[PDB]
Amino acid sequence: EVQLVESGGGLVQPGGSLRLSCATSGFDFSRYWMSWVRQAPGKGLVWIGEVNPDSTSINYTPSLKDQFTISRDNAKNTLYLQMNSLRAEDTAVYYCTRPNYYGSRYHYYAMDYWGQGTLVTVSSASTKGPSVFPLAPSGTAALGCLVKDYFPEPVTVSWNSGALTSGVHTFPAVLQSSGLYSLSSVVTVPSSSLGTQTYICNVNHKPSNTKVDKRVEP
């Protein structure tokens, strides 16, 4: 099946530049138009622009045509987004999409395939890796991990290298008064499984290249 994976996201300073990539698999990339859509945190969807197979038609949302530049490498089956003079209002999740559903005489499509997105944070603040602390358990028991004082978002949390998925809740991060983020990841398990089963939370923070594997014990 069609696969779209974006990279290049992270922290950039205001007025700064960044280049996003969207690696693709499962289709002849050379024969399709490609698009970029963005979503500011907790806000709506914004179409950035599109590029045809030839790169002879490159259309943009007018308010963004001055700082964004779309391009592709057909031999590498990769789509690009060059972002310049970035403002705080450009902080968003950036998605590459694959337009199709033509069969029309006119320039019309629906975006039938989207990638999972890459978050771009525009801030003058510095990167900081998290401190990971266990939330030790006391029928059903709850245990967790406290991922504290990191910048910027996101952090990814998995349990037992993806083996434990049910009863997992990874809370949205809250911005603390220090200017740094903090979150918790919890899981509910049988109280009988505590002193027998091993529980390890896997914390990843790509902006600071931090990888923590924390064993949670009662």
Partner: protein
């Protein structure tokens, strides 16, 4: 730029209910209108294109109608997995534009939270800070009240909350309340408790620990 306007912007409906969302375009776009579903923490997914055509794999409970300026998206029988933000999108003129979104929540029976308290780890105390965590697991409705008591003295301003989005399987919420104290302020007191008030609880539930 054609302006897409959705109504309602938010709604709560029950499993089995027929749900109708409208979309209005600032000018005639014929049938160049698409509907997308964005499930919590995920990327949008195409549901309908050309006003009424279901994309491959989309359930038959979803349908679309309309023409020119006025459009409708219908869920014939609402299911817990339908919790999402729904977006209309015009594909008539450049730039392509989206509606502001319709946030759809599921109304279900009252479910009391399961409450758990967590003391600060020894490791964190070595840094000179203490974080006390109170977890309210799988409740409904979203409204819940967490009161921190430090030696039976009510606290304010020194805690932060975080609520998950509605669960796509059981339609519930989970909430985390974190009380941040300096190691000096934490070493001063013995009883730490979080008192929980919710529709599902006949009497406020308190979870406590002694330092």
């Amino acid at each position: 730029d054609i302006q897409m306007t959705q109504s309602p912007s938010s709604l709560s409906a029950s499993v089995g209910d027929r749900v109708t969302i409208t979309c209005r375009a600032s000018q005639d776009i014929n049938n160049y209108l698409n509907w997308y579903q964005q499930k919590p923490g995920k990327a949008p997914k195409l549901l309908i294109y050309y006003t009424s055509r279901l994309h491959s794999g989309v359930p038959s409970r979803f349908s679309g109608s309309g023409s020119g300026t006025d459009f409708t998206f219908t869920i014939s029988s609402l299911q817990p997995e339908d919790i999402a933000t729904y977006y209309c999108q015009q594909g008539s003129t450049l730039p392509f534009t989206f509606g502001q979104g319709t946030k759809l929540e599921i109304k279900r029976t009252v479910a009391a939270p399961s409450v758990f308290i967590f003391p600060p780890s020894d490791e964190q105390l070595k840094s000179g800070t203490a974080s006390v965590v109170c977890l309210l697991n799988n409740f409904y409705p979203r409204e819940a009240k967490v009161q921190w008591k430090v030696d039976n003295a009510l606290q304010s301003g020194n805690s932060q909350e975080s609520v998950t989005e509605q669960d796509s399987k059981d339609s519930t919420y989970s909430l985390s309340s974190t009380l941040t104290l300096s190691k000096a302020d934490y070493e001063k007191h013995k009883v730490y408790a979080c008192e929980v008030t919710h529709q599902g609880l006949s009497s406020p539930v308190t979870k406590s620990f002694n330092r």
